[PDB]
Amino acid sequence: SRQAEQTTEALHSAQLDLNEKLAAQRAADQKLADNRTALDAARARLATFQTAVNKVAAATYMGGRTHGMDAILTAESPQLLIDRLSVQRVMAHQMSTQMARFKAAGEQAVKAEQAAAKSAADARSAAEQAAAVRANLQHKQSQLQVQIAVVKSQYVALT
Amino acid sequence: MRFGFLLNEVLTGFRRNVTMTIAMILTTAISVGLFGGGMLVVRLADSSRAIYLDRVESQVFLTEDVSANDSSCDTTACKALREKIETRSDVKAVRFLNRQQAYDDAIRKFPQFKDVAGKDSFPASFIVKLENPEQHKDFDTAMKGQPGVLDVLNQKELIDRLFAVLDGLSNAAFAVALVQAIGAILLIANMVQVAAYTRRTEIGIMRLVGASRWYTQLPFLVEAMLAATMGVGIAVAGLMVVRALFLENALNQFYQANLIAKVDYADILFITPWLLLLGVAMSGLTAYLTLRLYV
Amino acid sequence: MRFGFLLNEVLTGFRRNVTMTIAMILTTAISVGLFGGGMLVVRLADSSRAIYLDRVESQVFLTEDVSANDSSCDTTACKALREKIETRSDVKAVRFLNRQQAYDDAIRKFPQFKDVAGKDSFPASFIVKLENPEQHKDFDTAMKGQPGVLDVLNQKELIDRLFAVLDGLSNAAFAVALVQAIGAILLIANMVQVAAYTRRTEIGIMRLVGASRWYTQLPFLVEAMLAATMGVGIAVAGLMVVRALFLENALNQFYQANLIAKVDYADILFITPWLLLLGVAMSGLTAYLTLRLYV
Amino acid sequence: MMITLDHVTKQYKSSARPALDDINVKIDKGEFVFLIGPSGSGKSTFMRLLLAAETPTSGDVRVSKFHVNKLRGRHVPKLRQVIGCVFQDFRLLQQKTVYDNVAFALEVIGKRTDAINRVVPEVLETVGLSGKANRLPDELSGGEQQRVAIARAFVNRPLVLLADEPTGNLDPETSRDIMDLLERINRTGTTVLMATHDHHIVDSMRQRVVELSLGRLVRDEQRGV
Amino acid sequence: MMITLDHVTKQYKSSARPALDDINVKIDKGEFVFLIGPSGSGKSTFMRLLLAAETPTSGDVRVSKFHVNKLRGRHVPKLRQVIGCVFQDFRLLQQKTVYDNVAFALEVIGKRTDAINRVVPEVLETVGLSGKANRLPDELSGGEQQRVAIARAFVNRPLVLLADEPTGNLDPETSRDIMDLLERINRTGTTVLMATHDHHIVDSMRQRVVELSLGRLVRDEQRGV
């Protein structure tokens, strides 16, 4: 009668692996609920900012020739020229800050894309290892049916 | 026969004359350098017309409902604005331009948007040429307040002054190079006179024993050909060191200002063979045609 | 003293030898005219900078938290940065500037960037007038006693950097004029080396009869002196005619612009005796030693 | 078919005494001959007419190769190949070697390098200067400057030699070894116009003398004193 | 106190024969002397040392004055007024007139303009050239090129008239009138040193003779031929 009693405690102790697999896929799902959300916000702010950076880039095409010697060419008096440099020097910093913020946002978008790809690979690996936990449970937890089937036949000489 | 017997007397002529000969180097160097500088700055002039508009031109900017959607000028809103400027006798023709042709020309007029700045930003232009560049006070201020026009550009005023100061120094450098060349072409002609003065014995003995007429002025022309090439070499060497040290404080700033065209140190190679042939031609034309009637 | 003998002697020397002095009379003219042009360019630069320095004031930027306030200055910080800056020497008049005013004058006098310039981009500024804007090296270094500021961009120094295209052209003209000086010094030095070859006859007679060592050099000296004076006198004419043909046409539009102090009939004449006193001495330094050390 | 000129004149700009008027001289083959006259005879103009560096005003000049009055300037150096000349000033480059100056007269023509030096030792012994071939002419004394000047046109075979006063700068003590040099040159086969100017040397060797007096021949007999 | 020089030499760079070795030549006032010398010996250096155009290697030069061996260059041009010299090829400027050349030496010394022309016919008649005095020297014949050179050398009252071979390209007939032309000049006012080249003209008038053979005194008696 030892052919069935040897695996009695295995059915009781085989809940820990499925519990930790469920916890691992839950942790993967709850990080999955935030990672592409953060990536979508990071790409969406740059998406809203392309329509501003290209507009300020193309804004100098309609007569914004003031970034060098040409700014005195469109000047009529020294009085309107001496105060023009005071706003020209602070305006020339504005698109420099725009290009710096654009490069920073592009680097942040590339980092968010890399993080999203790494998280997708991690979620795929977590799903792949979690599927193997419930793959063999169909024959792991069918031993209780074997125990119930041999419980009736365990009577010696029909009791 | 062998040309190596011509080399051991031009060196002796340079040994016996160290003051007339280097004045040749400097005097060809200044004229060749000024002519090359004038050619370089007039090449910068007509090279800069590709990024700008000529005097017979105008610029205007349309709205987004015509430039972006229905990019070809086929709607009646585009017709009623395009044909309205031909109701008055001031223009000659218009040009079909749209957002399809907005970024192929954006490279040449702004050397900083070839990177990913953003597509579909430049509006339609439809440039028009007017034969009367004096009614531009009110031609630009006729589209103001009218829908269908975003704004108007008229940059043709006050760029004739920058063209004027750009080509006036070219004309001045051409005049100074010309008058230096007039001062130098007979300096070529008295090289041979002072050489016949200081080498009067052997020219006066080769004609008595009998020499060929070509070989009489061969050792007066071989050193002139190499002196001309040395002069143009010192000229093209010295134009860089005045360009890169004393003059490299404005044109480097004009790249960010996008005023001049793409000008670099390789632009001199397009004119070095013409300058090389010009120097030896202006040497040999006066080194030979003087000595025809002397002997 | 027999002054009139040298008058026909120099004409006899010019008649016997004209082909080298008629080239020298052109090349020393360019050698002094480039120096005169560079000197008047330096004059133009310093004159324009001096007449436009008087309307140069000083600007200071402020931090964002003190510039995001209301337009009137009522808090303790903005008077705290105001009351202790008026009690200075170079400070005579400080005008408070708001944020919303900068989006008015930079649009009305500059019809661009009207939809892309952010509202929180032009901070409040204090325009400060100084009686010594060239001596502004103290004012920018005295701003560590004033907190609440971001930076000072050297007040308004964008005038000499603006004039850099001709600041780097004046020294270029001087450097190429020293090339012509060192190319004409030796030409004057060996003028007499071919001049004596043309009049070896009477200089030998006048050596053996016993003329003075000083007096034997005057027929070789005043033929350089009068030619040098005529060289500067044709140089000023050549600069005059190139100015009135090429540079004044490029500066007639600066009359209404009023951006250059310009030159006239008197600026060329204010340096003309200064050109003679250097050109004649430049001839006479190397026309005197070339007789006492080679003849 | 001799080598001689006839009926020569040279007016230049001002005629006055335009050298000669009409001559009928004759020079044979290898015939030694003088040309004697006053100071203003125009010996140098006669030499220039013989070299055809100035065209005659009248008549023709012939050196038995062509009539040299109307030759093309192309053929003038070919005339100058067979003609050598000497002067007062010796025409010597003061910096090149003594063997370099004599070699200069043949390498200006140009041939193989062995052929220049195949004749320079063969001719340097003919003049009598057997040595000092590596000596500068300034280091050489004055008596052999004219000797190396004469020993310059002999790098080839000149059919007619002509001389314009080698003597005068040479003392009669040291012209004794240069007056007999011209007889040694004459006996080889080539002729020379020894255009002397004084009369002490005329009546010494008693050779052919052509007299002249402002273009008029005083006497011409080609024999005796 | 006496105007003579002695014990001189000239080595230049290569000595060889260093001009003179040990001479004691003395000349008196108003003497007509010759100078016998071989062409390789050196005579023009001795006349150059009299003009102080070459520094002597030894001895002292002294004419009419103190010792001029250490003569200052400032006192060099005040010497050459009382020394005049003539050369071989006439030293004549072709562009100037005949009267212009003779009025050129006294003009550059510096005096009143009225005294310049007061002596031009006074010396032009003594040289037998008072005629065709406004002609170019090229228009003049070769027999009188020295006759304006000697008068140019005698525009003042000098002490010595040293002569570096006035003849040499003149006839023996045309040398007779110019060797005695200096004789009246000698007997009137000056001493004269006619440095000869040959020996034919030397033993003709039977005057004083000097023989210099590489700086050696060979014949010095000042009598006879």
Ligand SMILES: Nc1ncnc2c1ncn2[C@@H]1O[C@H](COP(=O)(O)OP(=O)(O)OP(=O)(O)O)[C@@H](O)[C@H]1O
């Ligand atoms: N360059 C010249 N142009 C014209 N005629 C000249 C020239 N040289 C000389 N004559 C003329 O030639 C004649 C004398 O010539 P020149 O004075 O040259 O001497 P020469 O007799 O040739 O003697 P030598 O060669 O021995 O000095 C004169 O009639 C003179 O006018």
Ligand SMILES: Nc1ncnc2c1ncn2[C@@H]1O[C@H](COP(=O)(O)OP(=O)(O)OP(=O)(O)O)[C@@H](O)[C@H]1O
């Ligand atoms: N430039 C010189 N360099 C070296 N030695 C010289 C120079 N000039 C002359 N001599 C020397 O002077 C002597 C010869 O002098 P030069 O050549 O003047 O002729 P000369 O014999 O005085 O006669 P002539 O008056 O006929 O020329 C030699 O001893 C020679 O070395």
